[PDB]
Amino acid sequence: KEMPQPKTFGELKNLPLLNTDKPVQALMKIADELGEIFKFEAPGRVTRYLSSQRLIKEACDESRFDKNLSQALKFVRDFFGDGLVTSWTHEKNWKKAHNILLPSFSQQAMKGYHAMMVDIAVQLVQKWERLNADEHIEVPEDMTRLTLDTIGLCGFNYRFNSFYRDQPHPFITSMVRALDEAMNKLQRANPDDPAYDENKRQFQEDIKVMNDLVDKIIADRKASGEQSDDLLTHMLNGKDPETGEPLDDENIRYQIITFLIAGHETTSGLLSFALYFLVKNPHVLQKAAEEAARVLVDPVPSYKQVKQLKYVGMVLNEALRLWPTAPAFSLYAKEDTVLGGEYPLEKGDELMVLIPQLHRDKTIWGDDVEEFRPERFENPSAIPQHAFKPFGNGQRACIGQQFALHEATLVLGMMLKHFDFEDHTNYELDIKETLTLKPEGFVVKAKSKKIPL
Ligand code: HEM
Numbered sequence: 001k002e003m004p005q006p007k008t009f010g011e012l013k014n015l016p017l018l019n020t021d022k023p024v025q026a027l028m029k030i031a032d033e034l035g036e037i038f039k040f041e042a043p044g045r046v047t048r049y050l051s052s053q054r055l056i057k058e059a060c061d062e063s064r065f066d067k068n069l070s071q072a073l074k075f076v077r078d079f080f081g082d083g084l085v086t087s088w089t090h091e092k093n094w095k096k097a098h099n100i101l102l103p104s105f106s107q108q109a110m111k112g113y114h115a116m117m118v119d120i121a122v123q124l125v126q127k128w129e130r131l132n133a134d135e136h137i138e139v140p141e142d143m144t145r146l147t148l149d150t151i152g153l154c155g156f157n158y159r160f161n162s163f164y165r166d167q168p169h170p171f172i173t174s175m176v177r178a179l180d181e182a183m184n185k186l187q188r189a190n191p192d193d194p195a196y197d198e199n200k201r202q203f204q205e206d207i208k209v210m211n212d213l214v215d216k217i218i219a220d221r222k223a224s225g226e227q228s229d230d231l232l233t234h235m236l237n238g239k240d241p242e243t244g245e246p247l248d249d250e251n252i253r254y255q256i257i258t259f260l261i262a263g264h265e266t267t268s269g270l271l272s273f274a275l276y277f278l279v280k281n282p283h284v285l286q287k288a289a290e291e292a293a294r295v296l297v298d299p300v301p302s303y304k305q306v307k308q309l310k311y312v313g314m315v316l317n318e319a320l321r322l323w324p325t326a327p328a329f330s331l332y333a334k335e336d337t338v339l340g341g342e343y344p345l346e347k348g349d350e351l352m353v354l355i356p357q358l359h360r361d362k363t364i365w366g367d368d369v370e371e372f373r374p375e376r377f378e379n380p381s382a383i384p385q386h387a388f389k390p391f392g393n394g395q396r397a398c399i400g401q402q403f404a405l406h407e408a409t410l411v412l413g414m415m416l417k418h419f420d421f422e423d424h425t426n427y428e429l430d431i432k433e434t435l436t437l438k439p440e441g442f443v444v445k446a447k448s449k450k451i452p453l
């Protein structure tokens, strides 16, 4: 069977078809035109974009396909290094760091993080309680304050104190510019053109800002008199059983950057999308708010109570269905093989999973895929099989999935308990792309219910 492919432009291949600050959304349109799979070429690389659960199910067979470092991950590696997100599965430091850091996401560890998550969540609530009537909330900006500070405190006993800053934290500003640069590099035909010299200088400056922050985290741990057993403790003290060696210093720095960035950006996106869909679906908002009030009966939430916020969890999963904030992951063929009994692949051929398209496969989800309907997830028998992949696949799946969802469920529950939300601008959804996805310009007003904290 012939591989669908969009129009090419000489030696620029398909690259002119993007030329946009919203490439994933452009690729979704192409997927809608060409179906479950299409080839996409740029100068120097080829990708096959998958959109159907039928093909993606096969791609997730780890006996035939392994995680690929997409060009995007290769660019992000310029500051993620060989951390968990940007290392090959057979790169020694991936398995070594995975074994050393997996205990930091056990159930017992999660319970240990709860109190610190509440610390930051309380700061978010208090900020909104203290706004004057003429003010409003910048949603993604405040969700970023919350999620960055949470991973900073839980993972590294470091306080970014983002709620003590009225502009984005400098680490965030450098992160956004670095992620934007990586995304933009995917589309530029002549990367060595002098017109990009300033981009390269800024990219290095933003990488330095990140590493100056890592220095403070390491210095502050060295000076601490308290005893921690958090993510940073495992980075520093965990051993490879085979060699008796810890992660080398260079890798540790990369893991810190990896977890600070990967450990908050997509969770901020999730919370922003969730609040967007809530204010656009008032009956769903009422049901979620009713659950929050019913379950969160104490001055602050306990770990167990967060687990009883079932419908809030459905809201979050349904937000991830429509707009998975890490919208793609990449695989490569371990050997020559045939995909879906139709598409021959050669060893090393790249398959890119378009998660937003997977999550809109009507043969799986029904015809109403564009509706925000958390009840999709209320009746177990009616939820599809391997059709929902916001956290990746297999042994390279998200290590922090339960960290993210516990944080998001806790915070969204507290938000719904303490405020009524008004979409005072009738905001039109505008999804900013920085590889990851997040609403931009999303503002609301929050009227306190005056419930003490
Ligand atoms: C909505 C929130 C999040 C989403 C949607 C998400 C999604 C993903 C996805 C799709 C992958 C796989 C990417 C690939 O296959 O190349 C991944 C990997 C990873 N995520 Fe997340 N993630 C989230 C939050 C977090 C958090 C909070 C942390 C840490 C605190 C984290 C740590 C990681 C790590 C370490 C990996 C790589 C694991 C490995 O390959 O060994 N993520 N994430």
Ligand SMILES: Cc1c(C)c2c(c(C)c1O)CC[C@](C)(COc1ccc(C[C@H]3SC(=O)NC3=O)cc1)O2
Pocket: 023, 024, 070, 072, 073, 076, 085, 179, 183, 186, 261, 262, 263, 264, 265, 266, 267, 326, 327, 328, 329, 352, 434, 435, 436
């Ligand atoms: C949890 C998490 C993940 C997984 C994460 C990132 C963050 C910040 C996270 O919090 C950053 C980007 C990145 C390293 C990579 O995300 C990608 C997004 C899109 C793509 C697709 C390429 S194909 C194209 O032409 N346009 C793209 O963006 C690849 C990777 O992933």
